[PDB]
Amino acid sequence: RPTLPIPDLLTTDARNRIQLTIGAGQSTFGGKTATTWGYNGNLLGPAVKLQRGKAVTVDIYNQLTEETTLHWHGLEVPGEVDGGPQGIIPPGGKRSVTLNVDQPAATCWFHPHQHGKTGRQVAMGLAGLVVIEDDEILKLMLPKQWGIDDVPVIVQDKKFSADGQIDYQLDVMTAAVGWFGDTLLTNGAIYPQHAAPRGWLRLRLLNGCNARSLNFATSDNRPLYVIASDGGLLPEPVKVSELPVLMGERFEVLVEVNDNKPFDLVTLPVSQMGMAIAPFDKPHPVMRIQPIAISASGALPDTLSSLPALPSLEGLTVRKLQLSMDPMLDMMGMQMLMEKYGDQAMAGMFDFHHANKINGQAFDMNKPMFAAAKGQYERWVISGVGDMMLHPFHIHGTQFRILSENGKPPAAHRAGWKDTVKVEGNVSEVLVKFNHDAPKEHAYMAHCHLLEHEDTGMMLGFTV
Ligand SMILES: [Cu+2]
Ligand SMILES: [Cu+2]
Ligand code: NA
Ligand code: NA
């Protein structure tokens, strides 16, 4: 097995600046080269490291021949620097953003938000990580050697053509069910191996698929200790056998490396349309962990962090967000999937470019749907009632609290700081507060993070 690639950990320079270059290059997957896109390289991106309380300016060079934008997913920053569809960086052009980091330690990420093209641009290879540190987290004595016992794990599926090129399409099928493929990548490599010191291994898991939800576990069933969610540390570890992760979500887990025997991180079959076609109809390796006897001192604390109380609910503004799909989209998509894949496509279970909607509207860039309060908790009620698709619903500008998730109180490891909530044929409720402003010219997005739904209308803008 190839060794797991580790995103460079990119800090500020003497002038408090970080340079990102967006560009095309070449990658090799199982023998055949593909044109890929990357930040500061051919594929994927670095891990931009930020400290709570410190400004940094990011200089962003668009070295594509097409428009793109750069969105910091998870960051509580003004709309100006949020990099939603209105933050065009022109091909050949340079844009600079000041990020004033004021939130708990967390693993966030970044990726394009090009209007109507976000799915293709991620599929082409564009994604990096954001490691936010603060004063609280460095006191915990967690595994902290980057790329040794503190390892980013970005999991994505891709589909490839006969010539080896990435085979991306926004069509009637993928607009309905998402883009998914048959090859799993972990930091860009097919089934890599990571060499991990005895003791505690820390993994920062990102589900960076366009459309495929995942479910982590190990091959010998050893536990994961969940220490952190999208928006950072939990109050204390949650110990699990398996860990479902939606598109765009991050969890940090600790795994015990307690003797010399190799095991795999795997992902278990999910009940989501399309996502259990072979080879994903059985447990599927993500990466091989190979124990090694070098220095490590990282520990698992009893107690991680102190989070705020849920605010009381009386008097909060409530906003209804109904997600919906043209029924014509569902049918033709369900059909195209059966024609192409046969009966396996359903295991576990006409212009489409505006067929997906929130509150009966496809995303309009020039009409924000509302102004949200600044600095005041609101309750957003997001409903997927009336359709059968999975919608990981994500809200920019914020880390929120899930009050109920698709019909139940959140699981314990999902009850902390989140920027994504599951919506799937039921209704979810989040408590949300915006500490920063967003004008109509640079509004915040709230959207399904199944990328093809987003691209085909399941997005709204809002101001603060
Ligand atoms: Cu985001
Ligand atoms: Cu969706
Ligand atoms: Na520069
Ligand atoms: Na253990």
CATH code for the domain of 437: 2.60.40.420
What is the rounded CA–CA span in Å between residue 354 and residue 116? Answer: 10
Same domain, residue pair 458 and 399:
yes
Contact 458, 406 (CB under 8 A): no
Where does residue 93 fall: left (phi above 0), alpha (psi -120 to 50 degrees), or beta otherwise?
beta
Token pair listed for 412: 């314990």
DSSP state of 124: T
Distance 109 CA to ligand 1 centre (A): 8
For the chain, give the number of residues: 464
What pairs with residue 216 in β-bridges? 243, 267
Same domain, residue pair 226 and 241:
yes
What is the rounded CA–CA span in Å between residue 101 and residue 52? Answer: 5
Distance 125 CA to ligand 1 centre (A): 17
Name the residue among 7, 39, 8 with its Cα closest to residue 23. 39
In a domain, 375, yes or no: yes
What is the rounded CA–CA span in Å between residue 198 and residue 115? Answer: 46
Range of the domain at 418: 315-464
Numbered residues of the known binding site: 71, 73, 111, 113, 391, 394, 396, 447-449, 453
> How far is C-alpha 143 from the chain's CA centre?
22
In a domain, 301, yes or no: no
Residue 182 one-letter amino acid: D
- Cis peptide preceding 279, ω within 30 of 0: yes
Q: Which residues keep their CB under 5 angstroms from ion ligand 3?
A: 19, 59
In a domain, 414, yes or no: yes
Angle at CA 421, nearest 5°, toward 156 and 179?
35
Instruction: Work out the number of other CB atoms within 10 angstroms of the CB of residue 263.
Output: 16
Same domain, residue pair 286 and 151:
yes
Q: What residue has token string 């589900």?
A: 207
> How far is C-alpha 189 from the chain's CA centre?
18
Distance 250 CA to ligand 3 centre (A): 29
Q: Which residues of 79-93 are buried (b: 16+ CB within 10 A; e: fewer)?
A: bbbbbbbbbebeeee
In a domain, 307, yes or no: no
DSSP state of 335: H
What is the rounded CA–CA span in Å between residue 144 and residue 316? Answer: 40
How was this one solved? X-ray
Same domain, residue pair 329 and 387:
yes
In a domain, 227, yes or no: yes
What is the rounded CA–CA span in Å between residue 259 and residue 293? Answer: 9
Same domain, residue pair 376 and 260:
no
In a domain, 44, yes or no: yes
Distance 278 CA to ligand 3 centre (A): 44
Number of structural domains in the chain: 3
Q: Which helix (H) or strand (E) holds 338?
A: helix 327-341
In a domain, 166, yes or no: yes
Q: What residue has token string 């259990």?
A: 276
Q: Tell which of 121, 144, 167 closes a domain.
A: 144
Same domain, residue pair 80 and 19:
yes
Distance 136 CA to ligand 2 centre (A): 36
Same domain, residue pair 138 and 179:
no
DSSP state of 260: S
What is the rounded CA–CA span in Å between residue 394 and residue 402? Answer: 12
In a domain, 77, yes or no: yes
What is the rounded CA–CA span in Å between residue 279 and residue 276? Answer: 8
Token pair listed for 233: 């540390």
Q: Tell which of 144, 171, 188 closes a domain.
A: 144
φ, ψ dihedrals at 147, nearest 5°: 75, 10
Question: Resolution of the experimental model in angstroms, please?
Answer: 2.3
Same domain, residue pair 361 and 444:
yes
Contact 106, 232 (CB under 8 A): yes
